[PDB]
Ligand binder design. Sequence first.
Ligand SMILES: OC[C@H]1O[C@@H](O)[C@H](O)[C@@H](O)[C@H]1O
Ligand SMILES: [Br-]
Ligand SMILES: [Br-]
Ligand SMILES: [Br-]
Ligand SMILES: [Br-]
Ligand SMILES: [Br-]
Ligand SMILES: [Br-]
Ligand SMILES: [Br-]
Ligand SMILES: [Br-]
Ligand SMILES: [Br-]
Ligand SMILES: [Br-]
Ligand SMILES: [Br-]
Ligand SMILES: [Br-]
Ligand SMILES: [Br-]
Ligand SMILES: [Br-]
Ligand SMILES: [Br-]
Ligand SMILES: [Br-]
Ligand SMILES: [Br-]
Ligand SMILES: [Br-]
Ligand SMILES: [Br-]
Ligand SMILES: [Br-]
Ligand SMILES: [Br-]
Ligand SMILES: [Br-]
Ligand SMILES: [Br-]
Ligand SMILES: [Br-]
Ligand SMILES: [Br-]
Ligand SMILES: [Br-]
Ligand SMILES: [Br-]
Ligand SMILES: [Br-]
Ligand SMILES: [Br-]
Ligand SMILES: [Br-]
Ligand SMILES: [Br-]
Ligand SMILES: [Br-]
Ligand SMILES: [Br-]
Ligand SMILES: [Br-]
Ligand SMILES: [Br-]
Ligand SMILES: [Br-]
Length: 138
Amino acid sequence: NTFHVDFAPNTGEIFAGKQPGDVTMFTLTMGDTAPHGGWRLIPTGDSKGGYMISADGDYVGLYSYMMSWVGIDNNWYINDDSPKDIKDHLYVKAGTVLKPTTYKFTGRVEEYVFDNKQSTVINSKDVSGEVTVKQGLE
Ligand SMILES: OC[C@H]1O[C@@H](O)[C@H](O)[C@@H](O)[C@H]1O
Ligand SMILES: [Br-]
Ligand SMILES: [Br-]
Ligand SMILES: [Br-]
Ligand SMILES: [Br-]
Ligand SMILES: [Br-]
Ligand SMILES: [Br-]
Ligand SMILES: [Br-]
Ligand SMILES: [Br-]
Ligand SMILES: [Br-]
Ligand SMILES: [Br-]
Ligand SMILES: [Br-]
Ligand SMILES: [Br-]
Ligand SMILES: [Br-]
Ligand SMILES: [Br-]
Ligand SMILES: [Br-]
Ligand SMILES: [Br-]
Ligand SMILES: [Br-]
Ligand SMILES: [Br-]
Ligand SMILES: [Br-]
Ligand SMILES: [Br-]
Ligand SMILES: [Br-]
Ligand SMILES: [Br-]
Ligand SMILES: [Br-]
Ligand SMILES: [Br-]
Ligand SMILES: [Br-]
Ligand SMILES: [Br-]
Ligand SMILES: [Br-]
Ligand SMILES: [Br-]
Ligand SMILES: [Br-]
Ligand SMILES: [Br-]
Ligand SMILES: [Br-]
Ligand SMILES: [Br-]
Ligand SMILES: [Br-]
Ligand SMILES: [Br-]
Ligand SMILES: [Br-]
Ligand SMILES: [Br-]
């Protein structure tokens, strides 16, 4: 139906070492023309807390442009009631060291409405993806 969510790895290449600037790991598009109050992304499994987890066992924090992180609630959220798509990127900060391995994210997107000074979920979707960082030519 009207609710839609698309979570994908970035369509380009990520290279190992110190990131020379903020680097997008994943894109998140979500929208609904039906009435609603906002959206949240809840990291699940080993991503709990807002992390990617690498095949080497390292946790790397992710940041959002469009959403705000609330650690109390293990979620990013944005309050938006418009019918237009929200286009966000989850990124790693400039200077972050990445290793040439696979980094995974798993989470759940929820769309919610407001009532009784709180909120109620009206739709949800599990999302996941991975980026395999390349060494680059040496
Ligand atoms: O304003 C609504 C938001 O409130 C935050 O405190 C919560 O973590 C989000 O999930 C969302 O419900
Ligand atoms: Br969908
Ligand atoms: Br998806
Ligand atoms: Br979509
Ligand atoms: Br691609
Ligand atoms: Br790739
Ligand atoms: Br680079
Ligand atoms: Br997307
Ligand atoms: Br509609
Ligand atoms: Br979980
Ligand atoms: Br290692
Ligand atoms: Br770590
Ligand atoms: Br953030
Ligand atoms: Br936090
Ligand atoms: Br917090
Ligand atoms: Br609380
Ligand atoms: Br949770
Ligand atoms: Br607000
Ligand atoms: Br707010
Ligand atoms: Br749109
Ligand atoms: Br947007
Ligand atoms: Br963005
Ligand atoms: Br680092
Ligand atoms: Br390594
Ligand atoms: Br309310
Ligand atoms: Br009510
Ligand atoms: Br109320
Ligand atoms: Br709530
Ligand atoms: Br709430
Ligand atoms: Br609920
Ligand atoms: Br639901
Ligand atoms: Br699902
Ligand atoms: Br997905
Ligand atoms: Br993927
Ligand atoms: Br290789
Ligand atoms: Br390397
Ligand atoms: Br290679």
